[PDB]
């Protein structure tokens, strides 16, 4: 029943950044951790980032390694994710979801996921 | 779950207090009635007055 | 572990004497030593079992006491068949059945 | 029992329940809670 609104897609030429933010409402946000994964439009998902509960354990991808970060606002419940030096292969879709536990590295999975924004890098 | 044996054994030692070391209990059960009667205390006869 | 040890090794007395000997214990076994007379000619026998509980079929003469670390046998008549050496055994710490050292009884 | 996080075990946390119905059959119905070791009090007759 909780809520996870998406905004920030849209098309950009490649080379260029945007800012993508997730914002929860339906639960406590303080003390959950939150991800962003890829789906391709013709293939299946893909995990790209996460943040923990709160802002001191991060990973990434390794194949978006140095060109991604995220930053989390638990003053207003949400999230943001930075756009930066994009390519043609970032034309997909991208989902907010919600992990179950606490940490970043843990063997529990994404519990509630939030519908996805397209994004599109061309001329 | 929620499926316990219900036997559990009682762990004696001799470093454990009073109110857990074993105790022998023998209960009698005492059939006392008017029923010709077989358990008898001590005691001696006497000529029949 | 534990320690037992025999204050008097080797006493003198006479047929009409009353002795005694005592057997301290590292830590307390509450109460659970036991007392045994060995014979060096025949098997040994045991005198008393637990603190103060006499064996069956041998004379009230001795006598058991003490409680805790230290542990006594008393003896009133000296009857001129109690030669023999006397042991305490603890039947309470972790080394099982741990003895202690003899006690030579010689009368005089 | 369904909190996200607990505190260490040096520090472990203490809290004072009152004035409410408390229900131990639910946590008699999880089955992940393998350990249920209770000692003084049967269970079974925790319930009343």
């Known amino acids: 029943e909780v809520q996870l609104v998406e905004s920030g897609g849209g098309l950009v030429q490649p080379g260029r950044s945007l800012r993508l933010s997730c914002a929860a409402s339906?639960?406590?946000?303080?003390?959950?951790?939150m991800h962003w994964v890829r789906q391709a439009p013709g293939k299946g998902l893909e995990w790209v980032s996460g943040?923990?509960?709160?802002?001191?354990?991060?990973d990434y991808a390794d194949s978006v390694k140095g060109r991604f970060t995220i930053s989390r606002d638990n003053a207003k419940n949400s999230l943001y994710l930075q756009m930066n030096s994009l390519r043609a292969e970032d034309t997909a879709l991208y989902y907010c979801?919600?992990?179950?536990?606490?940490?970043?590295?843990?063997?529990?999975?994404?519990?509630?996921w939030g519908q996805g924004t397209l994004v599109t890098v061309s001329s | 779950f929620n499926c316990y044996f219900p036997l559990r054994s009682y762990s004696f030692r001799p470093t454990y207090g009073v109110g857990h070391q074993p105790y022998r209990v023998v209960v009698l059960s005492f059939e006392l009635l008017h029923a010709p009667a077989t358990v008898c205390g001590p005691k001696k006869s006497t000529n029949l007055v | 572990d534990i320690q037992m040890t025999q204050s008097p090794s080797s006493l003198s007395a006479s047929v009409g004497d009353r002795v005694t000997i005592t057997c301290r214990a590292s830590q307390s076994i509450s109460s659970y030593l036991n007392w045994f007379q060995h014979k060096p000619g025949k098997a040994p026998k045991l005198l008393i079992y637990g603190a103060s509980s006499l064996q069956s079929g041998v004379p009230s003469r001795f006598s058991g006491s003490g409680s805790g670390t230290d542990f006594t046998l008393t003896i009133s008549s000296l009857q001129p068949e109690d030669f023999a050496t006397y042991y305490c055994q603890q039947s309470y710490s972790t080394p099982p059945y741990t003895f202690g050292q003899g006690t030579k009884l010689e009368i005089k | 029992f369904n909190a996200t996080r607990f505190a260490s075990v040096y520090a472990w946390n203490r809290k004072r329940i009152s004035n409410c119905v408390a229900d131990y059959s639910v946590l008699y119905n999880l089955a992940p809670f393998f350990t249920f070791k209770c000692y003084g009090v049967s269970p079974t007759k925790l319930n009343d």
């Open positions: 943040i923990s509960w709160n802002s001191d354990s991060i």
């Open positions: 979801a919600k992990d179950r536990g606490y940490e970043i590295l843990t063997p529990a999975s994404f519990d509630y």
């Open positions: 339906g639960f406590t946000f303080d003390d959950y951790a």
